[PDB]
Ligand binder design. Sequence first.
Ligand SMILES: Cc1cc2nc3c(=O)[nH]c(=O)nc-3n(C[C@H](O)[C@H](O)[C@H](O)COP(=O)(O)O)c2cc1C
Length: 357
Amino acid sequence: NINLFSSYQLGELELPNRIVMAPLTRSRAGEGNVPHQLNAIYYGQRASAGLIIAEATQVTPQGQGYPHTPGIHSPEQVAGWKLVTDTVHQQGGRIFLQLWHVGRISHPDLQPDGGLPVAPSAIAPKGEVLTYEGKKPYVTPRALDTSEIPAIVEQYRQGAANALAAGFDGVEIHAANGYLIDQFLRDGTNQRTDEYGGAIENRARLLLEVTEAITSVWDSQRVGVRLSPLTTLNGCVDSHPLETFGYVAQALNRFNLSYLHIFEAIDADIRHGGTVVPTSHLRDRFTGTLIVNGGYTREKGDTVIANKAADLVAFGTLFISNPDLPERLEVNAPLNQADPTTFYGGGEKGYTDYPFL
Ligand SMILES: Cc1cc2nc3c(=O)[nH]c(=O)nc-3n(C[C@H](O)[C@H](O)[C@H](O)COP(=O)(O)O)c2cc1C
């Protein structure tokens, strides 16, 4: 009778419970997009998680899309992240870094030399993007040349190598929420006519090449992949999500990965006649560890573990406000209410000052 509090063997790591801290952008990086002591305190406070997945962290300068997110491309960033991994390990926790490239979801003001964001296809996102000077309209990204795809893969490989030097326990490839890899996956954002567009094997190719490069740096059971099959975030939608995401789930088996992590869009059920990609479909086609996420509670997490629908359950919002979420869920304590006004940017307030039980 396994439940959220059951231990789990994730490759060589023994997780003390099945509760994962989802990756959460908090936009509190210092100069040079470098993590600092306050970020180490924040993650250390949450080290009772079975596994922490750190916030999305750009693998290269062009992969930044929002002010003050941390990177994993410079020696100063590695040193700052080692403060974080040192603290988490001292607290007896485990932490993976989520490796990011935002693709088109950026602005020239955040790019080297004020250049265009890059993407599979030159299709502007709708609406506005935050810059240092304030909100501005998006521009149209540059479509990468076929010859530049190896450079993207190499940027991910280097980000993964830097994460290894920073003392992480593993890495998660951010292939969700409409960022660069997801832009290639989904046909709403990828109109390419080379071997990276069109057929599903072509749209999946960037993710698979990135995965192969990263599993050349890390043992493969320390590499996870995140997908979000039915999100509409960032204007990124696929026309045949069951076929697309079911193909990816099966295609990842041969890499012997740490896990596949699914963020189940919060409106998946109401935004269709029903969910067009039940997670069961992905559970059936990926044979490894499955993390599920999106609106989970103690009740719902225990149910999915008991029914064998998932192995691990990641919590986002609740881990912002409850540093000791595992203990609170275990003893059925009150939960602190998250304050969205301090999710992104700032200092201690709404970051390290949510109380323990
Ligand atoms: C403030 C905030 C920042 C987030 N940043 C990231 C991120 O860096 N990477 C990611 O893959 N998802 C990110 N997400 C999505 C969360 O990981 C999670 O999937 C989502 O909030 C749903 O889970 P929940 O209902 O447990 O919060 C973020 C969500 C929030 C609320």
